[PDB]
Each structure stands twice: as structure tokens, then as C-alpha cells.
Symmetry: D2
Subunit: 367 residues, 4 copies
């Protein structure tokens, strides 16, 4: 289907070939999407609209660490492995993005997955898995154990490079963003740092923001779109006619950055988010994690840093920073466009942002 | 002169009466502006385009502390008294915003100022003054001692409530923002938290960003404006026709917030900055400090907290957060509009964003 | 069993009645201790030497939050709920301390425990459980699913005030500290803060440090102790004859704000420092402090019965000294409470010898 | 005179040749010590008991940056240049340690010092000087402008390697630690990291702690010492008869910035060994830097070797070095600082050498 650019939304900068986080060499992505049941929710019996998204920084067979740094916009949420990142500037294993109710199950499943796949002596390196959440409470039976260990194994083992599925998939399945359907979005930038061009890739799991704040390409678009407010049982449940008939950001780069430099990359995510108008609600867990696929730490070995960058080198750093801002901005709009209307638990209905209206608005604003 | 709204720039939200940080009860602002000399720079002899801006959270006569919390967007800069704020959640004395070369002089001057005004028993409370900088290196003889202790005393003693002077004044005098003239800007929002309305006021000293990134009301306006690039000696010095013929954000609120809650307010500034397009350059020291004028700590006494707010109360917190984002966004545009064209050290000429073109663009975009 | 003071170890300050975290009124502690199997390890079959320790800040029936703040000494470990604490200065629900392999199971079990006990409208408040770990890898089948949901429920439901069991129990069951047996330890201080008194309670799950660095009451005691090095099947496995993480929970009834509780938590490092360890590269050493008087009713107005000035040295120094001293003592109490244990792969770790310790203390403090 | 070891205080580990931060090659230290006036304080006239201590990480002629990271024990104090360090993991120029009242003067003086010495194109790199304080308020006329630009220039220009003067010198001149005389202290450790040796050097400016908490070599010694309490005009002013800390860590280990933060976070453990509990207004800070991981101005960073954070053999050796050198630097300070009378005739005693030596002899036969 069309992505944001295909509907005429302009963005600044040059995307990588896939315009996705997988433009960064090494990165694989996998989703398991769990959609079952309709109507009234009973805890433990669905409906389920949930899942898990896996990102392997160096592919699924890697036992090595990647240099990493994080940032917090608003920390009302969970992201495990982050004390490790703060302390030693790297993490081992995959990143899992999922629904809040699944964190514990995913965390233990990743440990289980390592058994028989990792040398015994190396197993202890698999004991701080990285698992993050947003809450799919409006569309999904959160507490009801809809996600199984097999679902997690399937995402771990099925992850791959190449085009990344966006929208109502994996961890984003039951999410809501800007009062429209939330989900997964991704984008990349190839940025010129003098005579070297690096790739910055971003994947988001979006469950944040309000329709009234939303900007797409700078256009405050909430009031321009007619209808498409959420419903319950065929009754408008939000907006002017109500009653009538968190954000996870994962940044990959092939730039050979040190961990403190990656924290800097992570802190740029907030500027990209800011472009699109949201203001970080009190309980919106908005977090960013950045890693390098060129600065790798072989397990029990010497760190591999193929080149080294000066933080005060504006030509290099600004190109990277702008890449993060732009790819984050675009990943967020790509999510909205990829996400289709869904009806879930308790008959809650949330519309995907209307393509026809969006394209019409973009054409009028950008003749 | 006209402020941003007067030129047809739309913003969301409701400003306070003055649309300035002084809409928050207790707050006084003072500037001393130093403009002397023209032509080639000789270190120690100008030209000078610098100054200092003072913000008294509770007025110039207060010996008490205000609850406070900070945030960093990019920390390549100086802001003293911040270890204190991080540790004990309050600061004593005024906030000074100035040029980088002035920090030491301002810091000692603020100590000198307390002598004779503050009981010898309370003097030690005046020994961690709050002084922050952006670099006026393109228009000002930074190292040349253009700022005097008397200049600092004048700003401390002359500060007042009511309308706040914007543009090329005080600490902002010699600054450059988005490749246009930088300086001081301010805005406020009155925000509804249930049956209680709070005030959020913001003042910025802006020296950040690139013209190519600039958004005003979502409009990427750099390429829409014709000319007005900086010059040297009548020769265009930047942009397409080149060669041819940091950010300090101060947030005040009357909301009775605890220090950790004010950190949250400070972290919202990045989103407001994000709206206007900048991407935080490698050497751009972009910082935010938030304080409450209702949560006051009498010197050596019991903290006064007139009411208490739950962090998980979205109705109250989201109103405050949106206030910070909107006031920050507008304060940044207000700065640009207030700042006039200036020629400074080494005949560097930086244009104020052209009012006529800006108004024309806003009219075409927002009929 | 004797605790540290009973063996003649001197400490500074005044302990509470129970000399435990439960000296802070309303705090409840529960353990489930899992000890089964012997001999060679088979992943998935044990031997198991693990468990879980639960701390209910306001008791097991509370749905309210407590003001909270944390500190990191060395962050190579997991402690969930901590982004929440950093952001909004409070956490809901119990603290669980456990073995690394159990984190996910405990996390989901805590959610399950809320279902049926918590009004449906309030359930979302139970979605960021606080769970922390140290690694019982030398005595326990870490990956082998030895801990069950029922074990977690039992600790949650069985938690109580009063005296706290120490040593090889709950989360500390399979741990190793200063090359001796690790485990759970607790201590408290009653402090004079201006013209009121407050209690500072500390509980530790200790799995950190090296014998050669250990100080007890300032005495570098590792070299003064004879034998008691770990073994594997009869063969001494460390020390001169070889081949022949730390979780700190601080409770107080002082009405502190979140940022002030961060300051409390940052004092733990000083008390840790007193006892000699130097925080190894992979030693996850963490502290979390909460107030039981500054409470946040769910969806309501925070309750702060009095307010303290950070610059009030009389009040704050007393509280800080309390943390340092209670931490120092909790660490030694752990060592003394922990008995010799043989576990997975016939690994054997000795409890610090009571007779030698008492002897050394007697000679050092006649 | 004697240092702590000379009075029979035992410590763990192996000190460098100088037992000082200057065991890290290329580091230079300079003090300017300002002692003048006696009797009653009149603000602006003294008595003065203050000064400044300069540490040049790569020597005074370096225009380059050093990789760096910091830690806070209790942040009630000032240390400039630290936002820079947190953000970009390096700092340019010298570290200055001084009295609280002097921070602004020192900060501007460091800028002035660069003019004429640094190419104009490079001057902007000199605009975030690193200046830290503790408060000499009981012995010194803090607000009275006792420190001059010339004093600062002298410490900057006079700094050198080799032995480092301790006690009542430079920034530590008017300080008070554990209710005894405070000041400057330094120590070092040479550590074995697998098949390589590194040096960890520590210098402190100590103005912290209470006598009742003090431990030296594990001995709670405040109560074993008789008298030596502070006085004001012949009248005991503390104790039964009453009728902040800056830690600089240098290493030649090629550590990245986040790794140096870990080093800095070890300082608290060494502080903890000596008993203090970090008072509410005690600004206790640590800064660590590498002299081998250097960043040529406007150039490519130079990292001669790289270390894995999970390499316990290498990291643990370094961490223990910080802890031990911090512990010893604190005791070296006390022993180096002599009894001093200052503003308002306040008198603060150096920890008594005779009593300390006897206590150590009794505890460690
Ligand atoms: C159907 C709904 C999604 S619309 C909603 C309505 C009624 O209270 N409130 C909102 O608009 C609310 N601000 C909101 C809407 C979307 C995402 C987050 C918050 N009721 C919901 C639902 O029942 O889950
Ligand atoms: C006159 C000038 C301001 S324009 C500039 C031109 C030539 O190199 N470069 C820039 O555009 C540069 N990106 C820039 C411009 C403004 C603010 C920050 C960076 N030369 C300057 C000057 O000499 O001070
Ligand atoms: C219902 C909400 C108040 S919480 C939810 C979401 N926040 C998260 O997902 C976050 N990680 C989180 C916070 C608290 C507990 C568990 C998880 C957000 O914001 N949503 C609100 C909404 O739908 O309006
Ligand atoms: C010339 C610059 C590289 S530094 C300057 C400004 N940055 C600051 O003001 C900041 N607080 C700072 C950083 C370093 C030393 C002293 C102060 C920024 O960015 N400017 C660049 C520009 O004009 O292009
Ligand atoms: C085997 C070790 C290298 S890891 C262990 C312990 N550290 C922890 O428990 C910590 N939370 C952790 C770190 C990494 C993965 C999982 C858990 C520590 O230190 N131990 C060493 C030892 O026994 O020698
Ligand atoms: C007089 C004190 C209350 S402040 C002082 C010292 N703390 C500092 O030096 C610190 N950097 C600082 C804190 C506040 C203002 C200025 C400087 C400390 O503790 N001293 C107390 C004491 O002597 O009793």
C-alpha cells in the first residue's frame, strides 16, 4: 500500500533505499501479530489485539553487543536493559517492543530462546533482555495472556532484513496514536558528513498524541479531516460529535559512534516528535534508544570501532542529528498511513487516518 | 512594535494578559544592553554587542528559594547553579542570561550585589548564583570585557514586572537565530486544569538553529523568504547567493509543582523547540530551567506548598505541559519578530526576519 | 540465630525495635524460598537455589502509591518500574527482589495477582510492577524455571510486618557476597531530625563484593579468617589454596518528596563503601528509597503531612546518616544470617564463620 | 612533612612513584596560596585564607581535549564545564579548584589567560572553563576579593609535574575537613589490568565530613583523639567542651567518556570508607579524565587502545584503584594540613600527628 510520500506528504532529506530502519546494514525486524475475537472484553478471554516486534541489531545469530545510548521524553513506561545501556554503553540480544501486559512473558521468552542457541558459558550474557512497552488497553485484553512464548519465538526466528511491515502489526497491533489508529512506522535518512555518507534508521511503535495537536508536514491537520473519530458500538466516542451517531523510538545507525554519542542521537528524537505537534501526556511513556551497527563489541572480546568521530565536528554530527529528526518525523507519519481502521475489545473502533482526505489536504497545501 | 501575532502568525492556546513570562505573579525582568563601536574587531576594544538579562523569580527583594527543575537538549554550554537545582530542587537569587564571555563577570557581580543588601547571616545563601550563556561571537568582541559590574547591577536593580522588552536587548543583544537576528523572546499561556487555571510563562535567549530548518506556524519559511541572508562588508555571506553583492529557555509557572515535576515541565521545552524545526547542532547549548512561584522556600524555613498535584492527573499535568510547548513555540517566533537588523563586529550584518515578507506568507498560508 | 550485634560487631547509631525495614510502620515483607535437588546441574531440572522477596511499602491491601527515588552505584542489572519512579516520583504495588532468571515470571505474576484483587477501573495502575535481580548462577539453575507463579503469590500473600527472616531466603537464597554466602539482610535506624524522630529501614539482597575487600566495623577481615573459601566437590575453588550485584531498599516514615528520596538513595553508596567493596564491572548495585508518610491515593491528591527543607542540615543529615549506618549494618547482618550452602554442580559456599568473627571482634574491640 | 603512610597508616594497593595525581604522565598541578591578615573579618579587607589549584590534564601548553566523565555524590556546589562533559565527553583547558567566592573571578581569568596564548581561531574553545568550589567561610573573607587575576595566572603558569604540595595550599587553603583542618590531598595507584599496567591518580580538595564519622584505615578515630577541637579566640567552639569535597581522577587508561563516568562513580566508595555521610549542603563531586584518550582540537580523537566494559579483569583493577587512591588522598590531606588561625580568630587544628601515630601503632602492631 501507499506510504506517506505516496500520498503526497513532503519531507526533507534523502531516505535510504527501503526508507526503513533495515537500510542500516545488519538490522533485522520481525513481527508476530495477534488478532482474535470481537465484542465485549472478558479478562483472560479477549478480544486480543496485540503482538510483539523484534529488532536484531546485528541479525538473529549475533551473540555480540552493539554500542548504545538512550533518552527519555517522559518515563511513564517500561524498557528493560536500560540500566545496562546507561552503565556499560551496550546491550546484547534483540530489542522487543510489545504491549504492556506482555512484558514479563516476552522477557522470559527471550531467555528461553537463548537456551540451546547460545554456548552455555555464554548464557549469562543473555540474562538482561531488552523489552519495551506501550499500552493497548483500548483495543486489547491486556491482562488476558493473549501472547504466548511461541508468538515470541516466531518473531525472533522470522525476523529479516529488507522491507519492514508497518501499521497494525507486532507490538503496534492494538495501539492508538493522535486519536487515529496507532502502530508501527519506519523511515531512514542517508546523511552527508563531508565525504562520508552515513545511514540513520528509525522505527517507532506509536501509541501517543492527540488529534488536536497533530501536525503532518507542519499542517495542523486534525481540524481539517472530517469525521474518522473513534466510536464505540456505532456511536462517536470522541471529538465535537461525541455521543452522536506512549511512543517507543528505536534508532539504528552505521556511524561508528561511542555510547555517549548515541545518547546524543537519542535526544534528537524529541525534536522530530515535536515537529508533529504532540506534547507528551502525563502517562505517555515516550522513550528513545539509539545503537550503532559498526561499533560492535564481540562477546568477551575487544570492542571494534572502525573509525572515530569528534563530538565537536559539526559537519559530521549535525548531519547525523538532522537525520534522526527527519527520520523520526517521517516514521511517525508513515505509521499513521500504514495503520488501517480497526475494531477491537469492547467494540472500540479506531480509524486509520483517511488517505483520501490526507492526500487532498497535502495537494492543496503543497500544489 | 508588532509581535508575532500582530504579523498574522497563528498560535494555539490562550496567552496571559501580557503574553510574557511576567504574566506569572512575582516575576521581574531586567536588561542591560551594550552596543558600542563599529568595524573591525580588536580583542579588548570591541565592537561590543552584548549584555545581560535578569529574571527575579520572586522579585528583586526576595531572599527566598523557588522550587525548580531543569532539562538538557544539548549540553554544550554553561548554566551555573544547576547542580544545586538537580540536588535540592530549588535555587536562590536571580537567573542571569548573558554572552559566553561575560559569565565569570556576571557570576562575581551577583555576589557583590548581595553584599549590603543581605544580612551577613544569610550571605552564604548567595554564593551559588545562576548564570547561563549563549555565544555572541559573530557580532561581539566576546573576550574584550565589554560588560561591566555596573551593567549587571543596573539590570538587577532595574528589573520590573509588566511588559518585557524583546529582541536585541540584554543577553540577546548580539545573538543570531535561524541565520536571522537572534535575541530575547517571551510568551505565556493560561491553561485550564479542571476548575483551576494556571499560568505558564516562557522567556528565551535564542542563538540557535538554521534558516533552512526554520518553521513558523508549521511553515518551512526559510526558502519562502527572499534575501535577508547575513553579509560582511556588503557581500552576501551565507545561503545560495553567498559571495555575491545555543538556546536558553526559562519557564515560570504559578502551578504549585514539586521539583521533580518542574523537571517534567522543562523536558517539554524540546517539543516546542521541535515545532519550529531546529535539530540542535553539535555545539548548540540548548537548555531549559523551570521554576514555580507558588512553591517557595523561605530562607532557612519551612517550604510553602499551597496545594499539591498528582503526577498522574492528566487533566492538570497535560494542561501545563501543553502550555510549556505552546509558550516556547511562540516565544521563539516572538524573538525573531522583535529582533531588528544589526551590523556588528567585523562588519557582520545579520537581518531581522523581514516583517513584510513574513506577514505576506502568513496571509497566503492562513487566509 | 545471632545477628551481627550478637556476635560482638559494633555499629554506630540507634536501631529500631526489630532492627529491620519493618520498623517503618505498615511495611510488609514476604519470602518464598526454593531449595530442591542436589548434584550436577541440568538446565530445566535444577538443582534450584532461588526464590523471591516481596516488600509491600504500605501493606498488601494498599492500592496507593508511595513517593520514591533511586540511585545507581553500577547499573549492570535489572530493576523495573524505575523509569516510572524517575519520571513521576512514585510507584504502585510491591517491590520484588529475585534471581535474574526469574524477572519475567515475577513481573507477569504480579500482574496476574492484581486480577480479581483490584477493581477493573484501577487495573492499569498495576501494569508497571517493580522487580529487581541479582544473579544466583553459581548455586542455582538460573534458566531452569524453578520459580513458579504460585511461589510468587505465596510471597505476595504471606508478607507481614514484624521480624524479617534474613540469610538464605527468598530472593537471596542462592546468592554469594564477599566470597561468603550471600542472601538477605536488614537493619534500621531511629534518628533525631530536628524536634521529631523518624525511622530509616533498609533491606538488602547481597550478591556482591570480594573477600579481600570486605571490612566489618572497619576491620579488613578476609585475611583474618582461616578457611571457609568456596569449594566444588571437595576441592577448594578460590583463595590461596584453590585447586586443592546488590539491591538496596530503603524505607522511611520521613515525609520526603521524590527528589529528596533520590538523595536518600544516593547515601547507600557510602554505607556500601564502609564495608570495602569497589563495585565490580558486572556488579549491578542499585538503591531505591520510598516514604510511607508521603503517599499518593490512587487517582487522588497526594498526602504530605509535613514538608522538609533540603537545606535543613539538622533534619537531612540525621536521615542521611541513618541510611549510611543502616545500610552498613544490613550488609553484615546478611553475612551472619547466611549459612553454608551446597547447590548446583556441588558448588559449596560458606557462611562467614561465626566463631572466627566473634573472636576477631573480641580482639579488635576488647 | 610526613604523609599518611609515614605516620603508620596502612593502605591497600600499590602507589605510584610520587603517590600523587602527577604519577599520570603529563599532568601538571599549580597552587596559588593566599594567606594575609589576622583578627576580625571586615568584608573586603580579609583576613584572607584562600587560593586556587590548577590541574592541566595534558600540560599547560595543550590546546587539546581529554576524554572525561563525572559523578555527583551531593550536588550542593558549583563545578563549571560539567554540562559540556556530560554532553560531549571531553573538556578543554585546565581544571581550577578554588573557594566559592572566587569562582567568577577564576572563570574570567582563565579566559583572559588564553588571549595571546591561543590562536584567535581557536579561542572559542577556551570559553567553557572548568572551575569548581568548596566554601572557606570559617577561615576566609569569602566575599572580599582576596583572590586576584594575577594569583590565577601564577597558578596557571607555575603548574608542573613531580611532587604535589598538599595541605593548606591553593584552593584548599582555608578549608575544614572532619572538623579538623581541610585542604589538598593526593594519592595514586598503579594497577594490573591483565597484561598491562595503568596508573590512577587522585587529587582532592577536602572541606567535608564530621569528626564523629571519620575513619582512618577503618578506625573510628574521632573519639580516640583528645582535644584538637576548633576554637574562636581561645574558646573551644565544637565538641563536648564547646564553651564539600572535590575529587579529580586522572588515568592513563584509554577509557571512553561513559567509562570515565564509571570511574568517577567509584569515588563515593572510597569516600564511604572514611566514614562521612555527605551533609545536606556538602557539595561532593568527582571528575575523571584520561590522558591517553585525547581529542586534538578540531581533529580526530586519538584512542590508542580500547577497553570492554564487561572485561572485569581490566575494569575491576581500575575501579579498585580509584577507591583506594581516593581513600588515601583524603587521609594524606588531613596529615598534610597544619593548624591554622584565620578570619575572626577562628582556629582549626590539623589532625594531631603524635596521637594518630600512636593510635595506628596500637591498632596495627
Ligand atoms: C473508544 C475510545 C477510544 S474514545 C474514548 C473517549 C471516551 O472517553 N475518550 C477519549 O477521546 C480519550 N481522550 C482518548 C481517546 C483515544 C485514545 C486515548 C484517549 N473512549 C475510548 C474507549 O472507550 O476506549
Ligand atoms: C557573516 C556570517 C554570520 S555568515 C557566515 C558564513 C560564512 O562562513 N557561514 C555561515 O553561514 C554559517 N553556517 C553560520 C552563519 C550564521 C550563524 C552560524 C553559522 N560567516 C559569518 C561571520 O563571518 O560571522
Ligand atoms: C490510559 C492511559 C492513561 S495510559 C496509556 C498510555 N500509557 C502507556 O502506555 C504507558 N507505557 C503506561 C502508563 C501507565 C501504566 C502502564 C503503561 C497512555 O498515555 N494511555 C492513557 C490513555 O489511553 O489515555
Ligand atoms: C561558533 C559555534 C561553533 S559555537 C556557537 C554556538 N554555541 C554556544 O553558544 C555554546 N554555548 C558554546 C559552545 C562552545 C564554546 C562556547 C559556547 C553555536 O552553536 N555556535 C557556533 C556557530 O556560530 O556556528
Ligand atoms: C558471572 C558474573 C560475571 S555476573 C554476576 C553478577 N552480576 C549480576 O548479578 C548482574 N545483575 C548481572 C550482570 C550480567 C548478566 C546478568 C546479571 C556478578 O557480578 N557476577 C559475576 C560473577 O559471579 O563472577
Ligand atoms: C556553612 C555550610 C552550611 S556550607 C558549607 C559547605 N558547603 C559548600 O562548600 C558548598 N559548595 C556550598 C553550599 C551552599 C552555598 C555555597 C557553597 C558545607 O557543607 N558548609 C557548611 C558548614 O561549614 O557548616
Amino acid at each position: 500500500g501507499p506510504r506517506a510520500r505516496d500520498l503526497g506528504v513532503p519531507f526533507e532529506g534523502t531516505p535510504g533505499a527501503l526508507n526503513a530502519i533495515t537500510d542500516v546494514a545488519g538490522v533485522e525486524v520481525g513481527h508476530t501479530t495477534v488478532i482474535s475475537g470481537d465484542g465485549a472484553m472478558v479478562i483472560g478471554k479477549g478480544p486480543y489485539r496485540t503482538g510483539v516486534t523484534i529488532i536484531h541489531p546485528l541479525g538473529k545469530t549475533s551473540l555480540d553487543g552493539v554500542a548504545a545510548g538512550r533518552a527519555v521524553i517522559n518515563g511513564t513506561g517500561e524498557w528493560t536493559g536500560m540500566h545496562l545501556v546507561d552503565e556499560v554503553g551496550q546491550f546484547l540480544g534483540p530489542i522487543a517492543l510489545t504491549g504492556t501486559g506482555n512484558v514479563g512473558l516476552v522477557h522470559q521468552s527471550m531467555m528461553d530462546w537463548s537456551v540451546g542457541k547460545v554456548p552455555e558459558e555464554a548464557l549469562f550474557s543473555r540474562l538482561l533482555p531488552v523489552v519495551a512497552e506501550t499500552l493497548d488497553n483500548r483495543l486489547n485484553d491486556v491482562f488476558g495472556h493473549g501472547l504466548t512464548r511461541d508468538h515470541v519465538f516466531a518473531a525472533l526466528d522470522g525476523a529479516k532484513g529488507g522491507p519492514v511491515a508497518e501499521g497494525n502489526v507486532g507490538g503496534g497491533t492494538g495501539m492508538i496514536a493522535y486519536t487515529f489508529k496507532g502502530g508501527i512506522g519506519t523511515s531512514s535518512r542517508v546523511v552527508s558528513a563531508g565525504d562520508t555518507r552515513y545511514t540513520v534508521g528509525v522505527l517507532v511503535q506509536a501509541n501517543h498524541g492527540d488529534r488536536n495537536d497533530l501536525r503532518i508536514a507542519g499542517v495542523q491537520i486534525g481540524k481539517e479531516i472530517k469525521g474518522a473519530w473513534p466510536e464505540v458500538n456505532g456511536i462517536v466516542a470522541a471529538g465535537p460529535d461525541a455521543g452522536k451517531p506512549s511512543l517507543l523510538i528505536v534508532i539504528a545507525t552505521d556511524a561508528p559512534l561511542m555510547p555517549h554519542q548515541l545518547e546524543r542521537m537519542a535526544r534528537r528524537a524529541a525534536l522530530g516528535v515535536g515537529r508533529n505537534g504532540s506534547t507528551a501526556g502525563a502517562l505517555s511513556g515516550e522513550f528513545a534508544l539509539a545503537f550503532s551497527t559498526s561499533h560492535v563489541i564481540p562477546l568477551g572480546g575487544k570492542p571494534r570501532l572502525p573509525a572515530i568521530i569528534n563530538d565537536t565536528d559539526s559537519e559530521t554530527m549535525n548531519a547525523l542529528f538532522r537525520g534522526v529528526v527527519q527520520a523520526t518525523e517521517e516514521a511517525l507519519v508513515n505509521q499513521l498511513v500504514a495503520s488501517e481502521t480497526m475494531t477491537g475489545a469492547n467494540n472500540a473502533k479506531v480509524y486509520g487516518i483517511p488517505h483520501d482526505q490526507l492526500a487532498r489536504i497535502m495537494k492543496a497545501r503543497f500544489p
